[PDB]
Symmetry: C3
Subunit: 355 residues, 3 copies
Amino acid sequence: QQLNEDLRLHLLLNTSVTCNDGSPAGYYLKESRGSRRWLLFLEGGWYCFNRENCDSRYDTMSSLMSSRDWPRTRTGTGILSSQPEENPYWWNANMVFIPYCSSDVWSGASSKSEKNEYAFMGALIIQEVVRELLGRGLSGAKVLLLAGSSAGGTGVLLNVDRVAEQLEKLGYPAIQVRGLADSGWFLDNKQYRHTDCVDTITCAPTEAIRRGIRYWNGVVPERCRRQFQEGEEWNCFFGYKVYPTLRSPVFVVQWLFDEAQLTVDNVHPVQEGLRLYIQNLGRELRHTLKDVPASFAPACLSHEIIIRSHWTDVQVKGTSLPRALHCWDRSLHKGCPVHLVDSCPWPHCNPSCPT
Amino acid sequence: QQLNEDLRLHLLLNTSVTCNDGSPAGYYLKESRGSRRWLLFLEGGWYCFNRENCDSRYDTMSSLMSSRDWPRTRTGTGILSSQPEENPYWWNANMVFIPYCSSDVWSGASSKSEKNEYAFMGALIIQEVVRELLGRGLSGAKVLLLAGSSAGGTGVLLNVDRVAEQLEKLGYPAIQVRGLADSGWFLDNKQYRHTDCVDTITCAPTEAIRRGIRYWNGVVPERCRRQFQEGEEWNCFFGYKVYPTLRSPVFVVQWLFDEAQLTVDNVHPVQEGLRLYIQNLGRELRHTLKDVPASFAPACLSHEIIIRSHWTDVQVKGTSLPRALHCWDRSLHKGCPVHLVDSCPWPHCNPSCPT
Amino acid sequence: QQLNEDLRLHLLLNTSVTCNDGSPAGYYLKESRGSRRWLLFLEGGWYCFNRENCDSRYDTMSSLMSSRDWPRTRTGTGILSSQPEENPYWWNANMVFIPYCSSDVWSGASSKSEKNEYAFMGALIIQEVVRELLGRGLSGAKVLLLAGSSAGGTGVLLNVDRVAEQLEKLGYPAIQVRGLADSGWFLDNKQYRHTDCVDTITCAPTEAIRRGIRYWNGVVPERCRRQFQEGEEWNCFFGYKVYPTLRSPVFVVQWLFDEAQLTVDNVHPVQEGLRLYIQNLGRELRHTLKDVPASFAPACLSHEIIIRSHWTDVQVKGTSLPRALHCWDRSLHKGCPVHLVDSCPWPHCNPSCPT
Ligand SMILES: *[C@@H]1O[C@H](CO)[C@@H](O)[C@H](O)[C@H]1NC(C)=O
Ligand SMILES: *[C@@H]1O[C@H](CO)[C@@H](O)[C@H](O)[C@H]1NC(C)=O
Ligand SMILES: *[C@@H]1O[C@H](CO)[C@@H](O)[C@H](O)[C@H]1NC(C)=O
C-alpha cells in the first residue's frame, strides 16, 4: 500500500563487499524516470574504533553492522520524500538510501578481513553502489547529489571527489557530482572536561579518528592527505580542513551546537566554566564557515536534519533550508541567499529550533 | 446592527441596462468621506457561452443572472473590509461591490436582446455604475482601483482602460484609474486530457471565449483587438496577451495553480503524465509574469483571494499581499518589493497556502 | 530556589538620597563576572506634578513612592532575563534594575525637601547608583547600556549624557555609555478632546511636564536647555527635541500608538474625527523617527516592551527587536537593519502585535 511508493532494497551482487559481520551490503532505490537528478544518501550513526567497542556495538546495535534485519522497502523522508509539502524542490528526484553497516565513517577500504572479525568497507560500498546504479539510469544523469547525515555527512566529505573521479574515469562526464553534508562538520577542539578515550561517546574526536583510521584501514582524499604529514590522515575527517581542497561543490548544513559534537566534547542555570565553553564552541564553528560560501547553520542544539520530516520548520534570517538548497542549485547554473549562519550565541536563541 | 457598517444596494436608474434575465442591475456602496480612494470590485463566477448552458445556469445559479435575490446590504470583506486587522492599508477607502449578473466576463455590450432570451451587458453595467458614482463623490477622487476576482479579474483587464477613457472623456482627469486583477490571468494552453466543449467546466479556455464573445456580443480593448486578426478578439481575454497594451497600471495576483485553470484544463501519488502537466503549467505561468513588474503569485492550488477574509495569511518571500499592494501604491507616487513569484514547483510547496 | 538566580536589592548607603516619602532609594543587582556589559534599567510608571496628585498616588500606588515594600530580590525578565530563549544576545550581561520611587521622570535634583512633603531626587538616585556600581565591577566595563521603559525611557533621554559625563569626570573613559529608550518618545501634540489639566491621566503632555519640572525642581540636558528659551526646559522631555543634541548613542523603541500617549491625548467602528486623529498621530510619530537612524516602531496599541517576557514575539519587516538591538551593537564596532518602522496606519494592522 505504502510499499508501492517506497524505496526498494537491493543487496550488492558482488558479495566480496560486505557489512561489518560479513553479510552483504546494499542500497534502497526508487527511480523517477521523469527526472535526471539523483540523490544518494549516506546514513550515519557513529562508528567503532576498536574490537571491544565493535563487539559492544554488535550486541546493542547490530542493525548498523549487518543487513540481516534490513526491511525489503523504506519510506523516503525529508529530502528523500516524494511528497512536495515535505520536499518542495527535490520531491521528483531518483532517491537512494545507502544504509550504514561499516562503522567506519564510509572510509573503509579493507578488501578482506580475517574470519571471526569485522570488515570495514565503507568506501568500497559507495563505489559498488555507484557502479550498479550506472546500469539503472544514473548513466543518463545531470546531477548526482551525494548527501549524508552525521557520520554520513562526514562520509560525503570523504567520498564526494572519489565518486566524481570514479565517474570521470568511467566516461560519464556530463554528470555533475555534488555534495551535501549534514551534521558532519566537526571541530577537533579540546574537550570541556578531558576524559579518557575508551567508549565511542567519551573519546575526543581527534583520538577517535586517529585510532579508527588505522583500525578501519581508512582512506582520505589525496589532495587533503598531501597537505598534512604522513600518518596524519585524521585531519581530513574534519570538514574545515578537508573542505578547501574539494573539487566538487558541497553545501554544508550544521547545527551550531551539534549533539554529537557536545557528546565527544563531553558536555552534559549552568556553570560559568561551561558557559564559556559552549559559547566559544558556537563561535569557533561560526568562524569555520566564513569561507564556506554555501551553508546553513542555526543556533540549535540538535542532530541531523535532511531526512527528518520537519526539516522545513527551521529558519535562518527568514530562510528555510530547502530554499537555501534551491538558491544553491541556482548558483551552479541576489534575492536568493546561500550563506545562512545564526549570529545568536546560545542553543535555542533561535525560536524556530526543533524540539 | 451590522447593517450600519455595510455596503448598500443601489439598483441602476437606467432600466435599459439589466442582468441576464431582464431584471435591473446595480451596485453595493459604502462611502467614506474622509477618503479620496475608491475601490470598485467586480464579482466573478464563470460565464455561459450558449443558450442551453445559460438555461442550466439559471436553474442552478440564478443569483448570478438576476437581482431578484440580492440582499439590501452586504458586509465588506478582504480589500473591501473597513476592519484594519483584515484590511491594513485600504480599510478607509470608498467601497464598491458590483455583482456579476451578466455571465459574460464583463465584456457584454448588447444594448438590446430579444424577449424570452438573455441580455449580456457586462461592459455597460460597469459604464453605468461609473456614471452614477460621479454623482456621489467619485468626481472628487484621486485613485479609482478597479478590482475583481476570477471572471471579475479578467473583467478588470477588459474594462480598466475603457473606464480610464470614460472619465477622461467626461472631464475628470485628476482621477488615476488602476486595475487589480485577481485569479483572472489564464493560459490558453492545451488541456491535459482533451475533452469536447459542452459544459462550462469542460470547455477549453480558448474555445469557451471564442464562442462566448460572439454569443455575448463581447468587446475587447481596441489596442489589443488591433494586434490580432479580425475575428480573433478572444486572444484579448488572456492576460499575458492583453497586458502589454494596457495604458492603466495593473497589479496581477494569481495562484500559480488556479482551480479554475485546472478545471478548464480538465485536471482532477499522481500519474507521471499528469505530474509533467501540472508542473509545466506553473512554469508557463511563472514565465508569463516575468514582464509583469507588479505581481503576487504563490505556489498554491486555490481560487480568488482579494475579498476573502484570510487574504493576509499567505506570504511569498517573506511578504504578504497587502504589503505588496502598498509598495505598489508607493511605486506610483527598495525595501518595498512588488514582484513576488514562488519558485517552488508544486501546489502547497509553499506552507502559507490557505486550505 | 529562584532566589539564587535573581537580582538582589541594595539600599543606597547615602541616606540623603531618598524616595518620595523619605525612605531610602536603591537598586537590584545581579553580576555576571564573565561579562563586561552592563544593563541599567530605569523603571517607569507615570509621575505626579503637584501635591494633591502625589498624595493621591501615595494612597493608591505607594510602591512607586517608597522602598518600604520592595522585596529582597527580583527575577530578571525580557532584556534583564538570564534565559537565552527570552534574551538571545544580552542574557549574560550584568543586570541592574533601579526602581522608580521619585515620581519625577528621573529629572529630580532637589537635594532637600521640607518635612511632611515629598522629595524628588530622580537624577541623583541614578548618579548615586552609578557611583556605587563603580565599586562592584562597573569600573571594568566596556558597555553601559542605560535602558528604561515609559517614564524610565524618557529618563534615559534625560540622564544618558549626564552618566556619560559622570564617568568621564571620574576617569573611567574606556566605558561606552549608551541609551535604550522604550515607550518614552512622546509628542507634544494637541489632545483629541482638550481637557483641563487636573489628573495625571488627563493632563496634556506639555502642561504636565511644564508643571512637573518646577515642582520636582527638574533638570534637563544642558545642550538641549540651551536650544530653547529659559523657562522652556519642558521641551527637553520630548524625544524628537532632545535627541539631536545627544552625544551618546541611543536606540529608540516605540509603539506607534502608545497607550500612554493616547491617554494624555485623551483618546478612549469609530468616530470619523477620531479616525483622523489616531491616524495622523501614527504619522506624526513615524515622521519624528525618520532622522533617528536606530529604531523599532510597530503599528501597535501597546505600552512598554523591553522587560516584558514576550518581547521577542513582535516583528517589523521580518525582524525582531533583539535582532535589531544586535545589529545596532554591530554598527558601533548590510543584512543587519536597525531602522524598523511600520508603514501600516492603524493599531494592529501589524499581526505580530501582542495582546
Ligand atoms: C565486485 O564485482 C564487480 C563485478 O565483477 C567488479 O567490477 C568490482 O570491481 C568488484 N569489487 C571487488 C572488491 O572485488
Ligand atoms: C441610461 O440612462 C442614462 C441617463 O439617461 C444615459 O446617460 C445612459 O447613457 C443610458 N444608457 C443606455 C444604454 O441607454
Ligand atoms: C552621598 O554620599 C556619598 C559618599 O559620602 C557622596 O560621595 C555623594 O556625593 C553624596 N550625595 C549627597 C547628595 O550628599
